[PDB]
Amino acid sequence: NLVIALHSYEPSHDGDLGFEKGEQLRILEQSGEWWKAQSLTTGQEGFIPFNFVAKAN
C-alpha cells in the first residue's frame, strides 16, 4: 500500500507527517481525506493529504 508524493509537503494539521515530492510513505490507513502513512526513509509516522501521494508506479 505504498505511495509516492507528487509535491513537497509541510505538515499543518495536528498529528500530520511531512514528506518531500516523490517521497515514499507506507500507507498505514487510507480512510478519509487524510491518509495515515508511515515514511520509509525516516519512517516517521503521521497523517498525510490523501490527495498528495500516488502509487510508486
Side-chain angles (χ1 to χ4, degrees), residues 8-56:
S8 336
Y9 190 49
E10 244 168 293
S12 266
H13 270 36
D14 263 54
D16 293 48
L17 152 75
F19 36 111
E20 254 226 291
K21 165 195 151 269
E23 217 5 73
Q24 317 142 251
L25 331 135
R26 167 174 199 208
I27 309 294
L28 313 178
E29 242 115 48
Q30 34 189 96
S31 8
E33 144 173 340
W34 282 88
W35 290 2
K36 175 36 161 243
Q38 172 196 262
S39 249
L40 287 98
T41 323
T42 91
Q44 274 102 257
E45 302 128 300
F47 266 44
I48 64 149
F50 87 132
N51 48 28
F52 235 44
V53 291
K55 296 313 182 144

